Paper text:
Here, we identify two O-methyltransferases from tea plant: CsFAOMT1 that has a specific O-methyltransferase activity on the 3ʹʹ-position of EGCG to generate EGCG3′′Me, and CsFAOMT2 that predominantly catalyzes the formation of EGCG4″Me. To explain the specificity of CsFAOMT1 and CsFAOMT2, we crystallized both in the presence of EGCG and S-adenosyl-L-homocysteine (SAH), a by-product of the cofactor SAM and determined the structures at a resolution of 2.0 Å for CsFAOMT1 and 2.0 Å for CsFAOMT2. The electron densities for SAH and Mg2+ are unambiguously assigned, but EGCG was not found in either structure. The structural overlap of the monomers of CsFAOMT1 and CsFAOMT2 revealed a root mean square deviation of 0.36 Å over the Cα atom of 190 aligned residues, with the most striking difference occurring in an α-helix (α9) near the substrate binding pocket.
In vitro, enzymatic assays with recombinant CsFAOMT2 protein confirmed that CsFAOMT2 has mainly 4″-O-methyltransferase activity on EGCG and a lower 3″- O-methyltransferase activity. In CsFAOMT1, this α-helix is bent toward the pocket, creating a deep and narrow cleft for substrate binding, whereas in CsFAOMT2 the corresponding α-helix is bent in the opposite direction, resulting in a relatively open and shallow pocket. Two sequence variable residues were identified subsequently: CsFAOMT1-L50 (CsFAOMT2-M50) and CsFAOMT1-Y184 (CsFAOMT2-R184). However, in CsFAOMT2, this residue is mutated to a hydrophobic valine (V49), which makes it possible to accommodate 5″-OMe and leads to the production of dimethyl EGCG. Notably, the side chains of arginine are known to be more flexible than those of tyrosine, meaning that EGCG may bind in a more dynamic manner at the active site of CsFAOMT2 and CsFAOMT1-Y184R mutant, thus conferring them 3″- and 4″-O-methylation activity. The Km values, 95.79 μM for CsFAOMT1 and 20.88 μM for CsFAOMT2, indicated that CsFAOMT2 has a stronger affinity to EGCG than CsFAOMT1. In addition, the kcat/Km value of CsFAOMT2 (6762.45 s−1 M−1) was higher than that of CsFAOMT1 (3830.57 s−1 M−1), suggesting that CsFAOMT2 has higher catalytic efficiency. Additionally, two trace amounts of di-methylated EGCG products (EGCGdi-Me1 and EGCGdi-Me2) were observed in the reaction solution and further validated by LC–MS/MS analysis. Moreover, 3′,5′-dimethyl ether (syringetin) and 3′,4′-dimethyl ether were obtained with myricetin as substrate, which means that CsFAOMT2 could modify myricetin on all the 3′-, 4′-, and 5′-positions of the B ring.
Numbering used by the authors: 8 to 138, 143 to 236
The structure:
Amino acid sequence: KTILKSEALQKYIWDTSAYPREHEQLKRLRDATFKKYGDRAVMGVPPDEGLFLSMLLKLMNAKKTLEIGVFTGYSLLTTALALPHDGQIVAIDPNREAFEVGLPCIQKAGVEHKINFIESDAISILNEMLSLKMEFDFVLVDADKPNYINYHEQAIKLVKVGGVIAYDNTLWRGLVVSKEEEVPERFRANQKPIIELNKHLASDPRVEIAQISIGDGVTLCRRII
Ligand SMILES: Nc1ncnc2c1ncn2[C@@H]1O[C@H](CSCC[C@H](N)C(=O)O)[C@@H](O)[C@H]1O
Ligand SMILES: [Mg+2]
């Protein structure tokens, strides 16, 4: 899976620059995910995106973060490894089984303590958090795309001024543009909420944005008010 010119170019990045710098337990988590879910493992954050997130977290001096959507935990383990010793992550996903695929790797890496995994749909947890308000340096959104705009309007209140909200899938499979037509039910579930998110973020004066053509598309939003 890639949004790049060729599969060979994507593999070149991984072979040259990501795999040689990838923590052993991140590799093991990827392999466990492929073994369990087969081609569904595509849903996970890929290794070049992971190494990018890791550097971003360090450059930002992030310490407290929020993850909306976890799956088997590739981005979660990436984040826990990148944060300082006193880092803490709140990570929300209704699928505890998927989390438990990655958990042994998280544990062997020694970073389980940095993670508060919450088995829930995210909206209800975020609503409760917004009902002292918790504050985060960084938020990663990689979950159910029809809710991404709704997550933005909660996350913009939970991230600190100067902090970052990152959205995965903002160039979803390269299919946000297409010469072919998509069928209504699939369009409404996938391309449409991303096309709409992208307009929403571009129009939001409360953030600065940078859409990055890495992974499945990552849009960084820096909160300015
Ligand atoms: N309402 C909801 N709230 C939080 N997570 C949800 C959700 N609906 C679906 N999801 C989750 O979003 C996930 C998307 S895949 C997340 C990928 C992950 N960041 C990685 O690196 O592997 C699935 O695990 C799914 O359970
Ligand atoms: Mg997703």
